[PDB]
Symmetry: none
Subunit: 243 residues, 6 copies
C-alpha cells in the first residue's frame, strides 16, 4: 500500500504528503518505492506527464534510476506504451519539466516503443519553445517514428507554420519519404497548409507519388483543399501561356 | 577510488573481494556505491553483461532500483549506450542471468537508447532459450529498433531458422516494413536463407519493393544468392510448365 | 431440315415434338442429330440456356457426349462463344438445370473461351442459390476470366451484397488483382456501394491501382461518389494520428 | 473384363485384336463399349494421343459422337483433365491424326478444362506443321489458358522462332497480358530468345512491368540471359547519345 | 536621330515618309540604317510584326540579310526575345507578310530564343491559313519550345479543332511528351476539348501520367471539365454494360 | 557561284582567298553572300564549328546577321539540325571562338532544334574551360534538352568528374528527373562513376525509380558496374549490423 500511496502522491503532485510518507526511509527504501511501476507507470513519469515541476525535482534529487524508464501514458483517449518522462513532458507541453529532465541527464533522443522522439512529441500539439529547447540540446531531426513519419511531416500535417519554418532553417530533410511514400508536401496538401507548402518548395521539396499513387496535387483534391489544387494547377499550366 | 574497486570486482565477478571492500560501510553507503556509474556503466550492468549470476544476485539484494539503469556496454568493438542489465545479459547469451533478472522484476520490454529490446538483443547472436523465455515472460515481438528492424527480420538476416520458426508460431507479423521498406523476405534474400523464406511464404508474407526499389528476388540477384533466385523464378514460372 | 427441326424443338423445350421427330430413328442417328451444331450451338446447350429441365434430361439420357461441348449463346444482344451447357444455365438463372448437369457429371470449372466459370456466370446477374450450389459442388472461387476479373470483383460491381458476403465467408481472396490491377473495392467505388465496400474491408481487402493507375479512392473521386472519398481519405490518414 | 480389353487395344493401336473382340456382340454393344471411359479416358482419346491413325479412323466409323468427348491424358509425368482427342493429337505431334480428326468434324477451338486450345497444345512442343494446319482450319489465335498465357507467349518461352514468326504474321496480339501480367516480350526474356524479341521489336513492342514489377530486361537479368540484358541496356540508353 | 525616324516609319508602315528620309543617302548608307536595331528590334521585324506588306517588300529590296535577324517584340504585354520577322508575322496572323517572307527565302524553322517556330507561333492564336502555308513550305511539325510543348499540344490547349485536325492528317506525333511529361491528351483534358480528344484517340494517343502524376482523366477531374471525365469513365466502364 | 566560293573559303578558313573574293563588293552584297546557307549551313556556322577564329572574327566584323542562325553540322557521324554558331563552337571545344561569339553579342542560351544549349554541348565531350566560361556568362544550368536530360545528367553519364563538381557548386539541381524519370544518380550508375555518385549523395541527391522501374542500384546491376552495386548494397545493409 505504501508503493501505491507514493505513486498517488507523485501523480497528483502532493509533495507535502510524499515527504511525510518517505519521512524516515533509507536510500534503498526510497529508491525502490520511487522506481516501482503502478498501472504500468512510474511516479516520475506521471509527475512529468502532468507537469508537477517541484514533484519532478524532488523525485530526481532522491533517485534518477527511472529517468529513462518508459511507461503507460494517455493522450487523446489512447494509451501510449513505453513513453519515458522526457517524451511525456514534451508531448504534454511542460517546458520547465523538459528543462529539469535534461538538466538531470535525460537522453534527448530516447523514444517511445513506436520510435517517437521527444522532438516528434512536441511537434504534434505544436509546442514551439520545447521544439527549440530540444533542437538546442542536440535532438535529432531525422529520427522518424515506426511509420517513417518525421517531425517536419507531422508539423506540416498539423499546420504548425512556425515549427515547420524552424525545422527547415535547422536543416530538416524536406525530401524524406515515410514507409508508405508520404512526403512533407503531402502533409501540407492534406491539411490545406498552402503557406507551409510554399516554404517546402522554397527549400527545394519535390512533388512525388506516394505508395498509394498519390502526389500532393491529388491528396489536396480528395481532401477538398481547393486552395492547394488551384495553386498547383496554376503552377503546372503557367508555362503554357508562352508563345 | 573505492567506487572503482567495487566496479572492477562486479565486472570481473570477484564476489569475495567486493565484500571486503563493502566491509565497514552501512547499507546506505553500499547502496550509493553500487549504484554509481563508472565508464558510463553501473556495477550491476557489468555483472549482467559478463554473466556473473552470483554477483547479479548479490548486487540486486543491496539495491533493487539499479535493475533498470541503462549504461555503456561493449559488443564486437561497438559501444552500445543506454543498455539495461536485462538487454546486455540477453545479447551476451547469459540465460541464468536473464531468468534471475526477470525473477527480480526486471522490465522485459525496457530498451537501449536505439529502441532495441532484450528480445531483439537475443535474436542477433541466436540465443534460442533466451528468446523462448522472454517470449513466455510477455516480451513484445513487434517492438522494432530505430531503423524499424524487427526480431523476425534480424533472425531472418542472421539465418536463425529455429528462432524464425518460433517467432512465427508465436504470431510475429511477417509483413512489417522497416523505415527503409525492408521486410523479413528481404533479410532472407540478402542472406540466402531459402528455408526461412519458405516458412515466411507459409505465413503468406507478401513480396514488396523496399526503399531501394528492390523486391526479395532482385535483392537476392544483386547479392548473388542464386538459390533464392532459382526458387522465386521457378515459382513465378511454375504455371508456364502447365498445358 | 431434320437437323434444324431437332435443334428448334430442343431450344423451345418442345419435348413431345422432338420425341416424334426421333421416333423412327436409330440410337446412332439420334446421337449424331443431338451432337451436331446449328449456328454454333448444340441442342443440349440451347435447352440449358433456356432452362428446359425435361429437354436437358432427355438429351443426356440419349447421348452424354455433348455435356462439355461449348458453343454460341446470346445475352443482351452480345454473342458469347465456347460457352458449355453448365455455364449457360448458371448465367441465365436455371437452378433446376444446373443441378441436373452436375448430377450427370458436368465439369464444375469448365469455362467459356474467355475463361468465365459457371460460378462467375451466376455472380454476374446475382443468382445466389446457383452460386451456393456451385460452391457446394467444388467450384473454384479464384478462377478469373481473361481480364483477371474474379467472382468477388463482379459481385461487388453489380451490387450483389448477399453473394459477395457468401464468397468472403467461403474464403474468397479479396487482395487479388486483375490483369489491369483492379481490386474488388473499385467496383464498389464506381457504383458508390459504401456498405458493400465496408463488407470487403471487414474481410481485410487490398487497395490496388488498376490499368488506368486508379485506386478505389480515385475511382470514387472521378465518379463523384464523395461518401466513399470521405471514407477512404480518413482511413488512409489514420496512422498520422499516432504520436 | 471386356471394357478394359477394348480400351487397352485402342491405346496400344491393336486394330486386329479390337475388331475380333467386337466381331460378335452388336453395333449398339460396340457403340456402348467404345464410348465408355477407362481411367478417366475414352478409347478414341488414347488412340489419338499415341497417334494410331488406323485405330482412330476405325473408332470414328463405329461412333462419330466420341470425337468431342474429353478425358484424362499423361504428358511428362502430369495429368491433363478434359482433353478432347484433337487436343491430345496436336500436343503429342500427330499431324495425320489431327488432319483426320478435323476431316471427321472436330471442334478446332475445343479446349481442356484449363481452357487450353489444340493450337496452344501444338505450340508447347513445337509442332509447326500442326500449328499451320490448325490456323488454316480457323483456330482462334487469341484463346489463352486459365493463366491467360497465349500461344505466342508459350512459343516465345520454348524458343520456337518459326511458330512465333508465323503467329505474328497471322495477326497474334503482341501486347496481350496474362492473369499475372506476363507478356511475350517477358517470355522472350525468360527463354533467352533474342531473335523472337528482335521480331517483336521490329513490329514496335511495348516494354511493361509485370505483377512482380519486372520488365523484360530485369526478367532476362535474373534468369541469366545476358545476351538479352546487353541488348536492352544499350536500347534503353540510346537517347543519351543525343548532343 | 535619323536611325530612330527610319525605325518609327517602318513600324507605323509610313512608306512615304521613309523614302524622304532615305532620299540623299547612298545604297551603302541605306543598308546600314535599315539593318540597325532600336529598342532591341530592326525596322523589318517591326514592319513584319504589324503586317505592313508594302513596307516589308521595300526593306527587303534594300537589305536581304536582315530577313533572319531576331529581336524584341511585344505580345499580350509580354516581350518575346530573338523573334525573327517570319515568327512575328506568323504569331500576329499576317498571311500576306508570311507568304512574302517565304518567297524572299526566309527560314521556315528559324526560332525565337525559347525555340518557338513560326508554325508554333501561328498555332497559339489559331491562324489556320498560316499553319497550312508553313506546313506546305516544309515547316517541321516536331520542333517543340523550351518546355517541350509542341504545335499539336498548344493547338489542343487553345481548342483549335481544325488546326489539330490538319496537324494529325499531316502526321504530327500524338505521343510526344513535354519536359513536365505533358501530352496532347492532357492539353485536351485541361481545356475541355472533348472533340479534339476523340481525334487524338483515333490516332491511338496513349493515356499516360504527367510529371505531376496525372493522367488526362485526373487532369480533367481537378480542372472541372466533367465532359472529359464523363467520357473517359464511361469509355473505361462500357465493357461492364455487357451481360 | 560566288556564294559557294565564299562558303568554301569560310568553311576551310582561307581568309586571304575570302578577302580577295569580296574585295570590291558593297555592304549589302557582302552581307547577302556571308548570310546565305550552302547545304543547310552558313559560312559563320562552319567557321565556328571547325574553330577558324580569324575567319569567325572577319565574318562577324562584316555582318552579325547570321550570329543566331541555326544550321546543319555533323558530330559522331550524325547530322545536328538548327545548331547556331555558339552551340557548334561549344560542342567542338573551340574556346577562343566561344569567347569571340559572346563578345559579339551571341545568345548564351540559344539552342539547337532539340533544345540543347551551348552549355549542354560543352558538357558532352567534357570541355571544362568552355563550361566555366559559359556559366560565368549567365548560361542557364537547368535548361534541359527535349528528353529532359540536363547538363549535370550528361556530365555524370560521360564520367566528367571536374565538370559535375563545378555544376554542383554552381547550384545544379541534383533531383531533376528527365522525361523518362532519369536522374543524375542513374547516369553515374550506368557509367560506373562511383566518385561522382558519392558527390551527388553529398549534395542531397535521392535514390528514385525511373519510368522503366529502375533505381540507380538496378541500373548499375544490368550494366555490370559492380563497384556501384557493392557500394549501394553496403549502404543499404550497414544499419543491420546494429544490435
Amino acid at each position: 500500500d505504501l508503493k501505491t500511496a507514493v505513486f498517488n502522491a507523485a501523480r497528483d503532485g502532493k509533495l507535502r504528503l510524499l515527504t511525510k510518507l518517505l519521512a524516515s526511509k533509507s536510500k534503498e527504501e526510497v529508491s525502490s518505492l520511487i522506481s516501482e511501476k503502478t498501472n504500468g507507470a512510474t511516479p516520475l513519469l506521471m509527475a512529468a506527464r502532468y507537469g508537477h515541476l517541484d514533484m519532478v525535482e524532488f523525485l530526481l534529487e532522491q533517485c534518477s534510476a527511472s529517468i529513462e524508464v518508459g511507461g503507460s501514458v494517455n493522450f487523446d483517449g489512447e494509451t501510449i506504451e513505453g513513453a519515458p518522462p522526457l517524451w511525456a513532458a514534451s508531448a504534454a507541453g511542460h517546458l520547465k519539466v523538459v528543462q529539469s529532465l535534461l538538466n538531470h541527464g535525460a537522453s534527448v533522443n530516447n523514444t517511445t516503443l513506436t520510435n517517437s522522439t521527444p522532438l516528434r512529441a512536441a511537434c504534434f500539439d505544436g509546442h514551439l519553445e520545447i521544439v527549440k529547447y530540444l533542437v538546442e540540446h542536440k535532438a535529432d531531426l531525422e529520427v522518424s517514428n515506426r511509420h517513417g513519419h518525421t517531425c517536419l511531416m507531422i508539423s506540416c500535417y498539423k499546420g504548425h507554420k512556425e515549427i515547420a519554418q524552424y525545422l527547415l532553417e535547422k536543416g530538416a530533410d524536406v525530401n524524406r519519404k515515410s514507409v508508405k511514400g508520404n512526403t512533407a508536401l503531402h502533409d501540407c496538401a492534406e491539411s490545406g497548409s498552402l503557406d507551409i507548402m510554399k516554404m517546402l518548395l522554397m527549400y527545394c521539396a519535390k512533388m512525388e507519388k506516394d505508395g498509394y499513387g498519390m502526389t500532393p496535387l491529388l491528396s489536396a483534391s480528395v481532401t477538398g483543399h481547393t486552395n492547394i489544387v488551384d495553386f498547383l494547377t496554376h503552377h503546372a499550366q503557367t508555362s503554357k501561356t508562352e508563345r
